Enzyme design. Structure first.
Site, mmCIF file in Angstrom:
data_model
loop_
_atom_site.group_PDB
_atom_site.id
_atom_site.type_symbol
_atom_site.label_atom_id
_atom_site.label_comp_id
_atom_site.label_asym_id
_atom_site.label_seq_id
_atom_site.Cartn_x
_atom_site.Cartn_y
_atom_site.Cartn_z
ATOM 1 N N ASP D 92 -10.575 7.553 -3.179
ATOM 2 C CA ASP D 92 -10.258 8.974 -3.268
ATOM 3 C C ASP D 92 -8.772 9.264 -3.007
ATOM 4 O OD1 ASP D 92 -12.763 9.210 -0.698
ATOM 5 O OD2 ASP D 92 -10.644 8.896 -0.311
ATOM 6 N N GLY D 94 -6.676 7.182 -1.435
ATOM 7 C CA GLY D 94 -5.961 5.924 -1.588
ATOM 8 C C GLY D 94 -5.215 5.441 -0.351
ATOM 9 N N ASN D 95 -5.087 6.311 0.657
ATOM 10 C CA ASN D 95 -4.228 6.047 1.830
ATOM 11 C C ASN D 95 -4.562 4.758 2.566
ATOM 12 O OD1 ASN D 95 -4.088 9.546 2.197
ATOM 13 N ND2 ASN D 95 -2.249 8.285 1.891
ATOM 14 N N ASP D 148 -22.035 6.519 2.478
ATOM 15 C CA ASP D 148 -22.838 7.311 3.427
ATOM 16 C C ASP D 148 -22.547 8.812 3.426
ATOM 17 O OD1 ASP D 148 -21.368 7.974 6.509
ATOM 18 O OD2 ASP D 148 -20.253 7.038 4.887
#
Lengths: 167, 167, 167, 166
Positions: D92, D94-95, D148
């Site tokens: 999402d 990417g961090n 999850d």
């Protein structure tokens, strides 16, 4: 060396379906189920078993080491107090490591602790430990596949194989 | 808008640690296998000073325990089976973490486990843990120094300080 | 088997550490966020003595790097982004481990990274690592004490000793 | 108060993963130093299914990464001179993945590539090169195949959408 198929992918899949059904039945009405995998070898079996358990549950992992002492290289990320814990192993042989892991987790006051393993080599047992569910009882061969390595290789095989000498 | 007052001086601490080291030296006289295990981060200064007052050849190791369940964020590097283990604490208050750490290590069958803390806050206890050596018993104040932090500050103070409001 | 000779006395060590702490204090004057980072286990005694000779508010944290790849067995507990980071080592010989630890930490974008060591063996150097603060520059001898072990013993000696094989 | 809706079926996931394993097999052909590295806990299911569709001898390892991206569990084995494939359930912002890549690059693998079962491109906050993608999706509330919600539903065999009923 070469690898022969000892337990086919489909025989493995059918057995995991049966284990899933038995586990679903046993924990029916529990919302506190957590499967705990012993890394690295249990992760494939764990992936397939979780998908065969029709109950909402959580997942966690431990990495336990081996010289003598059983040490925790990576502990669980989550709590287990008051939870129903299922330890998931690829293979139980001597039972040493599993026994200490069970005792370490018992200290946290889970509602219950049980154990499920894809393979069991009961002739290798040196400390007995209660194993609730077993995929397959096997002899003491070099097995690989479904998460199990030989020299770090072959975890990715979809079958349980046996490493055999060639020509 | 807050400040640090000296509660136990640099020299008072040193004299006490000298006395503890003498009693610990005597106690383990003739043990071939003494190991001091600190709980990080707080133990490290008291550990360094105490180890230097113990006139016996010995080993040092550390655990990092977590802070609901007590989990092991970093385990011992070495084995303790059949060894005399001295758990070394900066401060014992509730006793919860220390108690679980003792139970975890007991599973490894050390010859013995005993506990030494620099500070003890007896009025904070929530669980029974037996501590053989105590540097100083103190009331339940915000203490800092000799390894003990307040919001991570002040572990590096050479004295035991008390954090106080100003103005 | 062996004995241990005093090579650098307890008082010599204390005096040098005081000098280093003074220089370090001057260097980071006006810095809001100093963090000293020790590499375990070796650096903990030097760290305890050195932090007590640095007269600026600061934080302390620790890392455990593996003994080919340099892996992180225990990472920092706290963030270092934007902070002045002072790596603390008991001894620098090849520089291989310390170099990687520095590169790993630089990825977090600290404001600065500097290195201090109690001992330096410059003849053993295998990579270029710049060390701003060095307690003692020494020959390639088997040294112990002030945190440094031989076969896990002698970390608790208050002097830097030289291990000397006998008969 | 919620249910979960099937968003991508078990069979669609299985077929896509087989296609990914094929592309991956082809790409790494002739290399004997392939190692798949999953990020825990989310990647373990996709990893398990992906590894079994890769028809080359390879190794498998795991890391768990925590503002600072810290390493809570590092790899067990060396990656110097190896072809590394980072394996992700979803990407999402990417961090975390970006920093993990940077960390592993310091070890001098021969190459590092990234595969993800799910990709949320409009969620990207750091640029990171993603080599193989199972399904590119909008920013839905997703679960299943390792992913999850409140620690639940990693065990669902399909990608599900959590649909608030409250």
């Amino acid at each position: 060396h070469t690898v022969e198929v000892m337990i086919s992918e489909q025989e493995v899949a059918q057995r995991i379906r049966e284990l899933g059904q038995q586990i679903t039945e046993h924990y029916q009405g529990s919302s506190d189920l957590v499967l705990v995998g012993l890394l690295r070898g249990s992760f494939v079996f764990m992936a397939d078993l979780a998908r065969q358990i029709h109950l909402t549950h959580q997942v966690d992992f431990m990495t336990a080491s081996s010289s003598r002492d059983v040490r925790i290289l990576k502990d669980l990320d989550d709590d287990i107090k008051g939870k129903d814990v299922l330890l998931v192993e690829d293979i139980i042989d001597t039972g040493n490591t599993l026994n200490k892991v069970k005792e370490i987790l018992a200290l946290r006051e889970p509602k219950s602790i049980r154990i499920c393993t894809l393979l069991d080599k009961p002739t290798r047992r040196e400390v007995d430990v209660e194993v609730n569910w077993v995929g397959f009882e096997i002899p003491d061969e070099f097995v690989v596949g479904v998460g199990i390595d030989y020299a770090q290789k072959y975890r990715h095989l979809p079958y349980i194989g046996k490493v055999v000498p060639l020509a």
